[PDB]
Short mmCIF file of C-alpha atoms and ligand atoms in Angstrom, two decimals:
data_model
loop_
_atom_site.label_atom_id
_atom_site.label_comp_id
_atom_site.label_asym_id
_atom_site.label_seq_id
_atom_site.Cartn_x
_atom_site.Cartn_y
_atom_site.Cartn_z
CA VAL A 1 -8.74 -18.90 19.36
CA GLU A 2 -5.15 -19.96 20.03
CA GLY A 3 -2.70 -17.50 18.38
CA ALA A 4 -5.33 -14.78 17.90
CA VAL A 5 -4.19 -11.28 18.79
CA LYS A 6 -6.44 -8.40 19.89
CA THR A 7 -4.47 -6.22 22.29
CA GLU A 8 -6.13 -4.59 25.25
CA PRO A 9 -6.89 -0.96 24.30
CA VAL A 10 -4.32 1.72 25.10
CA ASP A 11 -5.47 5.34 25.47
CA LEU A 12 -3.07 6.80 22.96
CA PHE A 13 -4.60 10.25 23.47
CA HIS A 14 -6.60 11.13 26.58
CA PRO A 15 -7.55 14.17 28.73
CA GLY A 16 -4.34 15.77 30.08
CA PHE A 17 -2.02 14.43 27.37
CA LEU A 18 -0.05 17.45 26.07
CA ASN A 19 -2.31 19.46 28.46
CA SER A 20 -5.34 19.01 26.20
CA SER A 21 -8.68 18.26 27.86
CA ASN A 22 -10.19 16.64 24.75
CA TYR A 23 -9.23 14.77 21.61
CA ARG A 24 -10.99 13.70 18.42
CA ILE A 25 -10.44 12.61 14.81
CA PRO A 26 -7.79 9.84 14.55
CA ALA A 27 -5.31 9.28 11.78
CA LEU A 28 -2.83 6.36 11.78
CA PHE A 29 -0.11 5.49 9.30
CA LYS A 30 2.97 3.22 9.03
CA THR A 31 5.89 4.86 7.26
CA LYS A 32 8.10 3.00 4.79
CA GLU A 33 10.72 2.79 7.59
CA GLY A 34 8.21 1.03 9.80
CA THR A 35 7.35 3.89 12.19
CA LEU A 36 3.75 4.37 13.27
CA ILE A 37 2.52 7.97 13.19
CA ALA A 38 -0.74 8.81 14.96
CA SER A 39 -2.25 12.27 14.53
CA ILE A 40 -5.28 13.75 16.19
CA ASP A 41 -7.12 16.97 17.03
CA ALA A 42 -6.14 18.33 20.48
CA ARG A 43 -9.45 20.05 21.25
CA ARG A 44 -8.58 22.41 24.08
CA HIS A 45 -11.98 23.64 25.24
CA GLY A 46 -14.22 20.59 24.93
CA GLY A 47 -15.09 18.29 22.07
CA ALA A 48 -17.06 20.80 19.96
CA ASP A 49 -16.17 21.55 16.33
CA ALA A 50 -14.81 24.86 15.14
CA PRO A 51 -15.68 27.65 15.59
CA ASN A 52 -16.62 26.76 19.23
CA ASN A 53 -13.17 25.68 20.28
CA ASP A 54 -9.42 26.18 19.94
CA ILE A 55 -8.01 23.05 18.28
CA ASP A 56 -4.37 22.14 17.60
CA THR A 57 -2.81 19.17 15.77
CA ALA A 58 -0.95 16.60 17.89
CA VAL A 59 1.27 13.71 16.76
CA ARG A 60 2.71 10.63 18.49
CA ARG A 61 5.23 8.20 17.04
CA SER A 62 6.14 4.57 17.68
CA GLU A 63 9.40 3.07 16.43
CA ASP A 64 8.66 -0.42 17.77
CA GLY A 65 5.52 -1.42 15.94
CA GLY A 66 3.04 0.29 18.29
CA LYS A 67 4.32 -1.33 21.49
CA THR A 68 5.54 2.00 22.95
CA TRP A 69 4.87 5.58 21.91
CA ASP A 70 6.75 8.85 22.33
CA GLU A 71 5.78 11.88 24.39
CA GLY A 72 3.88 13.59 21.57
CA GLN A 73 4.19 17.04 20.07
CA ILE A 74 1.90 19.79 18.87
CA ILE A 75 2.75 20.59 15.24
CA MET A 76 0.20 23.29 14.38
CA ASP A 77 -1.29 25.78 16.88
CA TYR A 78 -2.97 29.03 15.84
CA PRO A 79 -4.03 31.68 18.34
CA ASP A 80 -7.30 32.97 19.62
CA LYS A 81 -9.75 30.19 18.60
CA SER A 82 -8.37 29.75 15.10
CA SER A 83 -8.42 25.95 14.68
CA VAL A 84 -6.93 23.15 12.64
CA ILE A 85 -9.26 20.14 12.36
CA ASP A 86 -9.32 16.78 10.54
CA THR A 87 -5.88 15.43 9.76
CA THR A 88 -4.76 12.95 7.09
CA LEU A 89 -1.43 11.15 6.61
CA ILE A 90 0.33 9.91 3.48
CA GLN A 91 3.96 9.36 2.30
CA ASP A 92 5.81 9.61 -0.98
CA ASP A 93 7.71 6.33 -0.99
CA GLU A 94 10.15 7.54 -3.65
CA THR A 95 11.41 10.52 -1.58
CA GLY A 96 10.58 9.29 1.95
CA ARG A 97 8.64 12.48 2.64
CA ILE A 98 5.62 12.17 4.96
CA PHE A 99 2.71 14.57 4.45
CA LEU A 100 0.04 15.65 6.91
CA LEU A 101 -2.84 17.79 5.69
CA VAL A 102 -5.54 19.47 7.78
CA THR A 103 -8.41 21.95 7.46
CA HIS A 104 -7.77 25.41 8.96
CA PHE A 105 -10.21 28.19 9.92
CA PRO A 106 -9.53 31.71 11.20
CA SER A 107 -11.10 32.60 14.54
CA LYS A 108 -14.93 32.58 14.49
CA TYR A 109 -15.25 30.40 11.33
CA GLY A 110 -16.22 26.86 10.66
CA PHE A 111 -18.19 24.66 8.25
CA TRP A 112 -21.46 26.52 8.49
CA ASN A 113 -20.28 30.12 8.09
CA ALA A 114 -17.35 29.63 5.74
CA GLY A 115 -17.15 32.32 3.04
CA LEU A 116 -17.15 31.40 -0.64
CA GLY A 117 -13.98 30.63 -2.53
CA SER A 118 -10.27 30.24 -1.90
CA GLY A 119 -9.43 33.51 -0.14
CA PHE A 120 -6.85 34.23 -2.86
CA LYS A 121 -6.87 36.77 -5.71
CA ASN A 122 -5.07 36.57 -9.03
CA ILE A 123 -2.80 39.55 -9.67
CA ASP A 124 -1.07 39.36 -13.05
CA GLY A 125 -1.00 35.59 -13.18
CA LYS A 126 -0.15 34.61 -9.59
CA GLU A 127 -2.52 33.86 -6.74
CA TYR A 128 -2.08 35.88 -3.53
CA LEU A 129 -3.82 35.58 -0.16
CA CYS A 130 -6.18 38.47 0.51
CA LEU A 131 -6.31 40.43 3.74
CA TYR A 132 -9.08 42.83 4.81
CA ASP A 133 -9.01 45.89 7.07
CA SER A 134 -11.77 47.19 9.31
CA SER A 135 -13.54 48.96 6.49
CA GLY A 136 -13.40 45.98 4.17
CA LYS A 137 -10.56 47.25 1.98
CA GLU A 138 -8.72 44.39 0.30
CA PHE A 139 -4.95 43.87 0.41
CA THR A 140 -2.81 41.06 -1.05
CA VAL A 141 0.15 39.17 0.38
CA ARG A 142 2.89 38.88 -2.25
CA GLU A 143 5.93 36.85 -1.09
CA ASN A 144 4.91 37.67 2.49
CA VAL A 145 4.74 41.45 1.83
CA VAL A 146 1.34 43.14 2.15
CA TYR A 147 0.27 45.37 -0.79
CA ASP A 148 -2.76 47.62 -0.84
CA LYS A 149 -5.41 47.62 -3.53
CA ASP A 150 -3.35 50.06 -5.66
CA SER A 151 -0.33 47.73 -5.50
CA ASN A 152 1.60 49.93 -3.16
CA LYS A 153 3.78 48.18 -0.51
CA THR A 154 2.50 48.69 3.04
CA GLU A 155 4.43 48.48 6.34
CA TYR A 156 3.05 44.95 6.91
CA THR A 157 4.49 41.50 6.26
CA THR A 158 3.33 38.00 7.24
CA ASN A 159 4.78 34.55 7.79
CA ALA A 160 3.49 31.08 6.96
CA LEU A 161 1.77 30.81 10.34
CA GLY A 162 -0.12 34.08 9.73
CA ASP A 163 1.81 36.32 12.11
CA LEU A 164 1.41 39.94 11.12
CA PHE A 165 4.46 42.22 11.41
CA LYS A 166 4.52 46.01 11.22
CA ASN A 167 8.03 47.11 10.13
CA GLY A 168 9.37 43.76 11.33
CA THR A 169 7.69 43.75 14.75
CA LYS A 170 4.95 41.21 15.41
CA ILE A 171 1.65 42.90 16.30
CA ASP A 172 -1.01 40.17 15.81
CA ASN A 173 -1.88 37.20 13.58
CA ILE A 174 -4.20 37.37 10.53
CA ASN A 175 -6.22 34.41 11.89
CA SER A 176 -7.11 36.11 15.18
CA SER A 177 -10.23 38.03 16.16
CA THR A 178 -8.24 41.26 16.77
CA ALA A 179 -5.79 41.72 13.91
CA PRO A 180 -5.97 44.97 11.92
CA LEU A 181 -5.62 42.86 8.75
CA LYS A 182 -7.44 39.49 8.62
CA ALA A 183 -7.64 36.65 6.13
CA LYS A 184 -11.06 35.87 4.69
CA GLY A 185 -13.20 33.85 7.10
CA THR A 186 -13.37 30.50 5.29
CA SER A 187 -11.77 27.07 5.23
CA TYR A 188 -8.18 26.61 4.07
CA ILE A 189 -6.31 23.37 3.34
CA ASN A 190 -2.93 23.25 5.08
CA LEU A 191 -0.02 20.93 4.24
CA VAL A 192 3.04 20.10 6.35
CA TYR A 193 5.73 17.51 5.72
CA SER A 194 8.50 15.59 7.48
CA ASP A 195 11.76 14.26 6.00
CA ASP A 196 12.92 12.56 9.21
CA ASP A 197 10.22 9.95 9.67
CA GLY A 198 7.83 12.27 11.56
CA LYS A 199 10.24 13.62 14.16
CA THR A 200 10.08 17.21 12.85
CA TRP A 201 7.58 18.95 10.59
CA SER A 202 7.55 21.95 8.27
CA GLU A 203 5.42 25.05 8.79
CA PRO A 204 2.15 24.90 6.91
CA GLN A 205 1.61 25.66 3.28
CA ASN A 206 -1.83 27.01 2.33
CA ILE A 207 -2.80 25.16 -0.86
CA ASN A 208 -6.30 26.65 -1.21
CA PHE A 209 -5.17 28.60 -4.28
CA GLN A 210 -4.76 25.30 -6.17
CA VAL A 211 -7.63 23.13 -4.85
CA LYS A 212 -10.54 25.36 -3.81
CA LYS A 213 -12.90 26.64 -6.51
CA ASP A 214 -14.72 29.97 -6.39
CA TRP A 215 -18.10 28.28 -5.86
CA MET A 216 -17.03 26.12 -2.92
CA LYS A 217 -18.00 27.33 0.56
CA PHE A 218 -16.35 24.70 2.76
CA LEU A 219 -13.55 22.47 1.44
CA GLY A 220 -11.96 20.18 4.03
CA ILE A 221 -9.75 17.17 4.48
CA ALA A 222 -11.68 13.93 4.93
CA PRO A 223 -9.75 12.63 7.96
CA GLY A 224 -7.68 9.47 8.12
CA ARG A 225 -5.18 8.69 5.37
CA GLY A 226 -4.37 9.05 1.72
CA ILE A 227 -2.76 6.70 -0.80
CA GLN A 228 0.09 6.73 -3.27
CA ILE A 229 -0.97 4.89 -6.44
CA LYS A 230 1.11 1.72 -6.94
CA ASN A 231 -0.01 0.43 -10.36
CA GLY A 232 -0.55 1.72 -13.83
CA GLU A 233 -0.52 4.99 -15.67
CA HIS A 234 -0.82 7.18 -12.52
CA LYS A 235 1.78 5.29 -10.44
CA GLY A 236 3.28 7.66 -7.90
CA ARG A 237 0.32 10.02 -7.70
CA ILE A 238 -0.46 11.05 -4.08
CA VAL A 239 -4.23 11.00 -3.49
CA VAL A 240 -5.90 12.74 -0.53
CA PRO A 241 -9.67 12.45 0.15
CA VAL A 242 -11.60 15.68 0.69
CA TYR A 243 -15.17 16.94 0.67
CA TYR A 244 -16.78 20.32 0.01
CA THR A 245 -20.01 22.27 0.01
CA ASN A 246 -21.46 24.33 -2.78
CA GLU A 247 -23.18 27.68 -2.38
CA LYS A 248 -26.41 25.91 -1.33
CA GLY A 249 -24.48 24.11 1.47
CA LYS A 250 -24.76 20.59 -0.02
CA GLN A 251 -21.80 18.24 0.42
CA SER A 252 -19.86 16.26 -2.16
CA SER A 253 -16.72 14.10 -1.86
CA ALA A 254 -13.61 14.28 -4.06
CA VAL A 255 -9.85 13.76 -3.94
CA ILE A 256 -7.00 16.20 -4.30
CA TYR A 257 -3.82 14.80 -5.79
CA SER A 258 -0.22 15.54 -6.67
CA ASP A 259 1.93 14.07 -9.46
CA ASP A 260 5.11 15.89 -8.37
CA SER A 261 5.79 14.58 -4.90
CA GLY A 262 3.47 17.09 -3.15
CA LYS A 263 4.78 20.32 -4.78
CA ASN A 264 1.57 21.06 -6.70
CA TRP A 265 -2.00 19.87 -6.16
CA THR A 266 -5.19 19.50 -8.18
CA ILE A 267 -8.78 18.74 -7.13
CA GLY A 268 -10.59 16.14 -9.21
CA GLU A 269 -14.30 16.01 -9.93
CA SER A 270 -16.68 14.67 -7.33
CA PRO A 271 -18.56 11.41 -7.85
CA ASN A 272 -21.58 13.77 -7.66
CA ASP A 273 -20.43 15.43 -10.95
CA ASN A 274 -22.58 13.96 -13.75
CA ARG A 275 -23.73 11.31 -11.28
CA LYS A 276 -26.61 9.15 -12.47
CA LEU A 277 -28.92 8.59 -9.51
CA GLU A 278 -30.76 5.30 -9.10
CA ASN A 279 -33.59 6.03 -11.54
CA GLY A 280 -31.60 8.12 -14.02
CA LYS A 281 -31.61 11.75 -12.80
CA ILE A 282 -28.26 13.42 -13.46
CA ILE A 283 -26.80 15.77 -10.81
CA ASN A 284 -23.66 17.83 -10.33
CA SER A 285 -21.81 18.90 -7.19
CA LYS A 286 -21.98 22.57 -8.18
CA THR A 287 -25.79 22.59 -8.46
CA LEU A 288 -26.82 19.90 -5.96
CA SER A 289 -29.77 21.33 -4.03
CA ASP A 290 -31.06 18.26 -2.13
CA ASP A 291 -29.78 16.52 1.00
CA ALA A 292 -30.34 12.94 -0.04
CA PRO A 293 -27.48 12.50 -2.63
CA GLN A 294 -24.80 14.15 -0.48
CA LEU A 295 -21.40 12.43 -0.26
CA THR A 296 -19.13 13.59 2.55
CA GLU A 297 -16.05 12.21 4.37
CA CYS A 298 -14.41 9.43 2.41
CA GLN A 299 -11.34 7.19 2.09
CA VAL A 300 -9.81 5.72 -1.07
CA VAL A 301 -8.26 2.37 -2.03
CA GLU A 302 -6.66 0.98 -5.20
CA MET A 303 -7.70 -2.10 -7.23
CA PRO A 304 -5.15 -4.49 -8.73
CA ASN A 305 -5.09 -2.64 -12.06
CA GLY A 306 -4.88 0.86 -10.51
CA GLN A 307 -8.62 1.66 -10.58
CA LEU A 308 -9.62 3.74 -7.54
CA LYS A 309 -12.53 3.10 -5.19
CA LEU A 310 -13.82 5.98 -3.02
CA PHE A 311 -15.72 4.73 0.06
CA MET A 312 -18.03 7.51 1.24
CA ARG A 313 -20.10 8.66 4.20
CA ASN A 314 -23.59 9.43 2.89
CA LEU A 315 -27.27 9.62 3.88
CA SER A 316 -28.54 6.30 2.45
CA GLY A 317 -27.84 4.25 5.62
CA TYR A 318 -25.38 2.05 3.72
CA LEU A 319 -21.84 2.30 2.34
CA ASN A 320 -21.46 4.12 -0.98
CA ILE A 321 -18.60 3.38 -3.35
CA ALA A 322 -17.44 5.42 -6.39
CA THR A 323 -15.06 4.24 -9.12
CA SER A 324 -12.36 6.18 -11.02
CA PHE A 325 -10.58 4.94 -14.12
CA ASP A 326 -8.26 7.97 -14.40
CA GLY A 327 -6.49 8.26 -11.06
CA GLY A 328 -9.16 10.36 -9.32
CA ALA A 329 -9.68 13.04 -12.01
CA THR A 330 -13.25 11.84 -12.70
CA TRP A 331 -15.62 9.13 -11.47
CA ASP A 332 -18.01 6.75 -13.19
CA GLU A 333 -21.63 7.95 -13.12
CA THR A 334 -22.86 5.11 -10.88
CA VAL A 335 -22.24 5.27 -7.13
CA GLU A 336 -22.74 1.77 -5.73
CA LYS A 337 -24.82 1.30 -2.57
CA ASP A 338 -23.41 -1.77 -0.75
CA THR A 339 -26.32 -2.93 1.35
CA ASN A 340 -24.08 -5.41 3.17
CA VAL A 341 -22.37 -2.56 5.06
CA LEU A 342 -24.38 -0.23 7.31
CA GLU A 343 -23.20 3.40 7.34
CA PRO A 344 -24.84 5.42 10.15
CA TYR A 345 -23.56 8.79 8.77
CA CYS A 346 -20.05 8.62 10.29
CA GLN A 347 -16.46 8.61 9.09
CA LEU A 348 -15.10 5.24 8.00
CA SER A 349 -11.63 3.78 7.40
CA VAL A 350 -10.60 1.49 4.54
CA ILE A 351 -7.09 0.42 3.49
CA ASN A 352 -5.47 -1.92 1.00
CA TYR A 353 -3.90 -5.05 2.53
CA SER A 354 -0.59 -6.31 1.16
CA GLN A 355 -1.28 -10.09 1.11
CA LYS A 356 -4.12 -12.06 -0.50
CA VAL A 357 -6.74 -13.61 1.67
CA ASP A 358 -8.43 -16.83 0.51
CA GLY A 359 -6.87 -16.41 -2.94
CA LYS A 360 -8.17 -12.83 -3.40
CA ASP A 361 -6.82 -9.30 -3.14
CA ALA A 362 -8.33 -7.75 -0.03
CA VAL A 363 -9.10 -4.53 1.84
CA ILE A 364 -9.57 -3.90 5.57
CA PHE A 365 -12.53 -1.74 6.65
CA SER A 366 -13.62 -0.16 9.94
CA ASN A 367 -16.78 1.71 10.93
CA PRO A 368 -19.75 1.49 13.35
CA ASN A 369 -21.84 -1.41 12.05
CA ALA A 370 -25.20 -0.04 13.19
CA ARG A 371 -27.75 2.70 12.61
CA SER A 372 -25.89 4.66 15.34
CA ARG A 373 -22.24 5.19 16.35
CA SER A 374 -21.82 1.79 18.01
CA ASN A 375 -20.89 -1.85 17.33
CA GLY A 376 -17.43 -0.99 15.98
CA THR A 377 -16.54 -3.67 13.42
CA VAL A 378 -13.44 -4.47 11.39
CA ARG A 379 -14.03 -6.30 8.13
CA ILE A 380 -11.97 -8.05 5.45
CA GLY A 381 -13.39 -7.41 1.98
CA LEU A 382 -12.30 -9.71 -0.84
CA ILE A 383 -12.13 -8.03 -4.26
CA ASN A 384 -13.96 -9.82 -7.08
CA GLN A 385 -14.33 -8.77 -10.68
CA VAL A 386 -18.05 -9.07 -11.45
CA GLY A 387 -18.04 -7.99 -15.10
CA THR A 388 -16.94 -5.05 -17.19
CA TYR A 389 -18.28 -1.54 -17.81
CA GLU A 390 -19.45 -0.53 -21.28
CA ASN A 391 -15.93 1.07 -21.83
CA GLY A 392 -14.34 -2.35 -21.23
CA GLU A 393 -12.82 -1.55 -17.81
CA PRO A 394 -13.07 -4.21 -15.08
CA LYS A 395 -15.96 -3.87 -12.62
CA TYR A 396 -15.04 -4.77 -9.06
CA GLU A 397 -17.20 -5.41 -5.99
CA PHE A 398 -16.38 -6.57 -2.45
CA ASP A 399 -17.22 -9.80 -0.62
CA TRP A 400 -17.33 -8.82 3.07
CA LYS A 401 -16.41 -12.35 4.09
CA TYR A 402 -14.99 -11.67 7.57
CA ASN A 403 -16.65 -9.20 9.94
CA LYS A 404 -15.45 -8.89 13.57
CA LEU A 405 -16.95 -6.80 16.40
CA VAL A 406 -14.03 -5.08 18.09
CA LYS A 407 -15.76 -2.35 20.18
CA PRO A 408 -19.16 -2.90 21.85
CA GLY A 409 -20.84 0.38 22.69
CA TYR A 410 -19.68 3.76 21.43
CA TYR A 411 -17.65 3.79 18.24
CA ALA A 412 -17.27 6.82 15.94
CA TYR A 413 -14.28 7.86 13.79
CA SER A 414 -11.41 5.43 13.20
CA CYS A 415 -8.26 4.82 11.21
CA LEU A 416 -6.54 1.58 10.21
CA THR A 417 -3.00 0.71 9.20
CA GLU A 418 -1.22 -2.46 8.18
CA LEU A 419 1.76 -3.15 10.47
CA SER A 420 5.21 -4.48 9.55
CA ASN A 421 4.27 -7.99 10.82
CA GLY A 422 1.18 -8.10 8.53
CA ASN A 423 -1.17 -7.37 11.44
CA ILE A 424 -3.61 -4.46 11.67
CA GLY A 425 -3.38 -1.40 13.89
CA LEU A 426 -6.50 0.62 14.68
CA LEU A 427 -6.97 3.99 16.39
CA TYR A 428 -10.62 4.69 17.22
CA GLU A 429 -12.99 7.03 19.01
CA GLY A 430 -14.36 4.68 21.71
CA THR A 431 -15.44 7.77 23.66
CA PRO A 432 -16.91 10.93 22.10
CA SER A 433 -13.92 13.24 22.75
CA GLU A 434 -11.77 11.91 25.62
CA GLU A 435 -9.79 8.65 25.34
CA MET A 436 -8.75 7.63 21.81
CA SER A 437 -7.92 3.91 21.79
CA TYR A 438 -5.22 1.95 19.91
CA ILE A 439 -5.30 -1.82 19.36
CA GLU A 440 -3.38 -4.35 17.27
CA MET A 441 -5.21 -7.31 15.70
CA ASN A 442 -4.08 -10.23 13.57
CA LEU A 443 -5.93 -11.91 10.75
CA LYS A 444 -6.30 -15.10 12.76
CA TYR A 445 -8.44 -13.01 15.15
CA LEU A 446 -10.30 -11.13 12.41
CA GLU A 447 -11.18 -14.35 10.56
CA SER A 448 -12.19 -16.32 13.66
CA1 LIG B 1 -4.45 27.01 19.20
CA1 LIG B 2 -18.87 11.54 -13.10
#
């Protein structure tokens, strides 16, 4: 239609960019200053997941609304097949700080073989990263100084990137396959930040000691974006979707969040905690022993009153949606199955939209609308209150009134953003692990 915009795809990441053969896992975010930040996994040895790769985090920026992009940079790169995978972007609008979080594994580890727990030990009221020698003896890192099990200082120190120094000389890195002292082989959540609109980034902080429980095996970022709550009693809270496995390997979604501008973090309950399944069975994420109720990668949006909605990858074939009345600390016992939205067991993107559509608050959604990773479709969901819960809170559901096919054929992970002009940017996996495509769309197109 006249005035509709759907730009021809640009390969924002592609084989050879930053000398990486492969790319996967898009994240896309517009900063308060109007800059677009795109992050991605630079998968250097193919498209495979950790541990069968060496994966770094790459970032590109656009200062002109996505028309042109910079030359890129690598912002986290560990040695020897230690990988960072699955990025997410969020900003604290009060401080202008941008956050990027990612999952990190030492060499040889990934989802399936992750060890239990955080990899930290409490010594006299502070958590310290553990290191292990060849015989399995346990050491702790205390303000970057390595102590043995009898609390004697050793000759070793570390840095934030895991380099291992003997008397001040680098000898290895605690994430490698050869270091004489190694971190526990498990997942870790890393956090970096930028105070200059994404041009430069801090070195990673390992926040596992705050967010990973002793009974979790894997805990990872659910890739895409987070939110900062705009309304109500938890205004300002930074919310970052995650998912984890228990000791039996079964997956449940949650969010981690910060009320102090990213300094400290907490993990909330999963929607699988005290979940009431369809016919009344009650489950918990710690004890879940069946595949069918699993909840995995997810993205979160906010309702007009501040209520949160967690949209989740799951095994039902359809979108699942959880509701939180308390800023992501806990979820209502009922997970909605929205049979109007196919979910082929793939990551999805959902965002709030800043203007009403047809008189209603709205969200924008992207996923493969099929029983396979194909038929990539962007939707506009209109929020409607459909009643109240027994506790008197509003109950909201979505009217998926506008649904537009944007990518025939292959379509896997994706990430949306609203642009400064009110249009929609989208970065998507239109190939398995090679070209990652960016387009801009307007609502005239999406509603046509
Ligand atoms: Ca690397
Ligand atoms: Ca619950």
